[PDB]
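Explain this one:

_____
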Amino acid sequence: GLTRGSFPEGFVFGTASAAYQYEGAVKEDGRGQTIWDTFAHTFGKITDFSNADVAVDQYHRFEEDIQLMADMGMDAYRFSIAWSRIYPNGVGQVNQAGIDHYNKLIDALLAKGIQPYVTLYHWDLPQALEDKYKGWLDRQIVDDFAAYAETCFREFGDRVKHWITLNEPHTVAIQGYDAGLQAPGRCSVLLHLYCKAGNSGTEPYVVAHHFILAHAAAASIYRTKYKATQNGQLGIAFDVMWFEPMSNTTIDIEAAKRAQEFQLGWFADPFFFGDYPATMRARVGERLPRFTADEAAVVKGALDFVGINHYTTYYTRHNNTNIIGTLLNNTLADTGTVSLPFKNGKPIGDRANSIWLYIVPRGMRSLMNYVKERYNSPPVYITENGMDDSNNPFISIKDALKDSKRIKYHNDYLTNLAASIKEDGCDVRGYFAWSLLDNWEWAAGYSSRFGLYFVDYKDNLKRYPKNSVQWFKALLKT
């Protein structure tokens, strides 16, 4: 079976978390309102009517949780900084209590020998910036994010050596501005009646452009002022499904390739080559912003590593939008593809609790090779991988702990990962399980349990280890 010896010497194993999903204490120690506070407190936005005002209270309970990590022998913890705890209004007055908080968390981790991997932006934009200029829709976001990033480099960079500037910009751009299913909930009202405003054809591309520039702006500051003395590295965590052709036809083979370009390439082609993928330029046309030559020069080469959030694999077929009908532009239509976890009625694999999450371990290996080939072997971290159980009130806690399916998931995905490294030569440096604890899974609320530890929401957030805890412990034994 898998051991640490199955991976390169120095390979980093960790668990991942995110501020809004974990912290609670939403109105404590000066924290400003975010777009997700607003979204979670708006009717219709969260499926189980819940919110993250308390979440799992990691803001207060982080030392306990650090012990639960050390219990498995974890090397690292990925966590995010809530921008609104540092600048409650996005810009302006620095909140010293926010700085003090993350210093305590960082020092506590390091005292246990656990390395901090810090995400600067995990979707919780300060509401003040949304009100001021509609957040990621305005170019001002670029300098404002970079200033926030700089403050974090200055305050924490003496100890934090691994930075993830942005989490899943693809998800944010599509879910936040095309589907309007995540904050700020914008979209073409003609496509989705539940949105109050937006444009699914234009806004995702504007937001994505601004994410790319924001990262490059923060990376430029890091490299020019902090990197030589701090000696850390900056990356991004990209959401990436693997896509397989729905049929063995060149049209569908090309469609799967194109779907990948529109998902990963949308962001990574700028960072590696200085422009968007040709397919996107061709299909999105004037709705796709253009980089200036000076912007291309700051954007290209802006990553030290590629973070991959990888969960699942879908089939992809070529698709043409209906030639007759009122054309309502949107990002899926622009791809010229449809991707689905079914082929001829048959699912691609077993499903986890999440309706989108199909269990397809080979996708991990295929994707690692894809990244190696297209981008000339950049260092990669698997910044998230995992699966969820239901929140089932009809079973005992003891039965909820029997997560053999999660164990098989991690086993099979890691086995594929180990083979991509040893056999295929992929430069993978680490792996972080989503997630350490059951937590508030955005619009899914508390209905989805991704943790290695079970959280009893009906007993003051008590943590219990699921069977996967012992599985990871055995795996990581040195």
Summary: The chain has one domain: 1-478. The radius of gyration is 21 Å.
